[PDB]
Amino acid sequence: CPLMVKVLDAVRGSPAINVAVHVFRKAADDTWEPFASGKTSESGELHGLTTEEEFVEGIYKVEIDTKSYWKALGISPFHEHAEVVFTANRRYTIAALLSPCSYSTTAVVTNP
Amino acid sequence: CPLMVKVLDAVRGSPAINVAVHVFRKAADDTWEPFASGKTSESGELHGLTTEEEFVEGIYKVEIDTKSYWKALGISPFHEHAEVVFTANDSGPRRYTIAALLSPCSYSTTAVVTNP
Amino acid sequence: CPLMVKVLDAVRGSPAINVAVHVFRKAADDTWEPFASGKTSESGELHGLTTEEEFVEGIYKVEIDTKSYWKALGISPFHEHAEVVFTANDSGPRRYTIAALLSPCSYSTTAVVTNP
Amino acid sequence: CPLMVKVLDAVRGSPAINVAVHVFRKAADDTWEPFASGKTSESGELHGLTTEEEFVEGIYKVEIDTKSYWKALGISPFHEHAEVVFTANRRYTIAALLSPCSYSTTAVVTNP
Ligand SMILES: Cc1ccc(C(=O)c2cc(O)c(O)c([N+](=O)[O-])c2)cc1
Ligand SMILES: Cc1ccc(C(=O)c2cc(O)c(O)c([N+](=O)[O-])c2)cc1
8 A cells, every 4th residue: 555544633642433435536627536444443444545556646635534433432623524635746644633623634654 | 804824844944934835715607716816924824825705614625835834945845735624613613723733745734723 | 934833723723822842952062052942822833932043953852841831731742852853954944833732742843944 | 562552634634653652651750761763654553652661650651742644745734743641550542533633542452
């Protein structure tokens, strides 16, 4: 897997489980084209979104459905979602740490 | 001033100066319409984007041009920008500060919502 | 006012009000000596901790009582406190804002250092 | 391993490698007693700090030598170090995301 997403819950101090994640690629039209999606696991990780052949250079958008996550926990959230937009060139992990009114995100890029 | 944006630089430990910020509001037809824009000041703050009359209920998008910020400092950052999307004023008018702390490959954002 | 502390609450999206802050300075004998303390205000800010004369070169420790903050709100947090330790004024006087953003099991801290 | 430390570099977008980490336990005297230490791996992780029998309830202090890390990279840091102090009761991961003038830390507590 060249692209992985990890989501953490800063209120509970745990992985953020069953968070929906959608990934898009920017098309020539500068339209966002669907690319991959899934739900984080019990470890807060979402693997196997794409393959090395399919993950070409380009601009990608990762949309994390933070609002539904907090809703499911009965906690009032500020944001509609959390979007991460980046240019791909290696292995990429996009990590997000979530609070109801705040989030942070970082890239962890490593070479096998 | 019911919508303020503040941007900090986590590398230099300073305000993030002259950062372009564009604000959009979701229209009836579900498209993003331009709402207001500006640049952060020497203090990292952007005031005067809107007014109490103009800032009605709605879904707003604050797009912070982090890429140009870092590129102007000779750094190639990870993110294209940092977008913050939220529903405003659903229970009446509020005052909103959207703050972002920037690093070349990471950012965090928070909201300070107060009742004037 | 050369040392300010600002604390935000990432759960409520608001200033963190009435947070106790204790500041220490490392002494010649390598022990921590009490330097100043206070509580954050309604805006989450703590001003007036020290003065330009009193805030000399040194290593300082800012201990933010995050545990009491959360416990008073009925939350059992992860951390005992949040400590920020830094060398101040090594290249001349600066103005320092130490900011912290709090969640029950996480916090972040940053510094804004400006030249008055 | 009931206690693990993971350190990430927000400037480079990568694990923070070869960061020294010291763990202390609060003694009855309210003195900080050395407990474990190590250096993060190429993945930014430090495992095998302790055992389940040795990791009893109590107050622990994790000191991350952020200043040396940034020094080794030729980057001027603000903080002397990053300290994380918490009470143990499960498996604990203490994660830290580092910038030269900022850091964040969170707890990821999971049950096997
Ligand atoms: C670690 C962190 C992350 C984000 C913030 C932050 O969002 C913030 C918000 C403010 O209104 C504000 O005045 C300052 N400040 O002066 O430093 C910071 C503050 C701290
Ligand atoms: C405060 C903070 C915020 C974000 C991160 C963070 O990005 C991160 C990345 C990982 O690959 C990862 O495995 C974990 N973890 O398990 O805790 C956290 C790490 C620390």
